[PDB]
Amino acid sequence: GRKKIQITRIMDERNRQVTFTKRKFGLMKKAYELSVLCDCEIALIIFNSSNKLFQYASTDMDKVLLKYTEY
Amino acid sequence: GRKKIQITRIMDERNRQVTFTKRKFGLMKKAYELSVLCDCEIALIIFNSSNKLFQYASTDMDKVLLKYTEYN
DNA sequence: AAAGCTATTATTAGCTT
DNA sequence: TAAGCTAATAATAGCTT
What we know:
The structure is a homodimer.
Chain A: H1 13-37, E1 41-47, E2 53-57, H2 61-70
The first copy, chain A, binds a DNA duplex through helix 1.
């Protein structure tokens, strides 16, 4: 980025929301790539500060969470 | 990286495993950062090809999953 | 403004031993 | 070789309209 940032809560809602949307896209992109490159099964569940849900799964979310609970 | 790679399954077990270890670390680092920067609850569950479980949660995993199931 | 840009930082693929 | 390196790609923080 233009400047290095410290990893601590962004206090301004506007910057926090813009950062959330962009980093959430980048995080799902890296989960997708890991799933393909390394043939692994991945579930990603995200609740934002306003409590809205976002999710990504490389297969049916149900199959991954079942694997998790039955582990 | 030294060369750009296509996103498709790595066929060699050893390079696949080295890539898995490095990228899983990177992916958990970004999940952790998103949770802190944007004050969000996150759960990440990963099963590798050999079927081993790896996980990250910004709080107790069972809690996030509880939120998930209830939300639904 | 909201959406796109880019200067700079961050990740990582193959190199090195 | 398994662990460290670095050239190169990828992500992204603030800049811009």
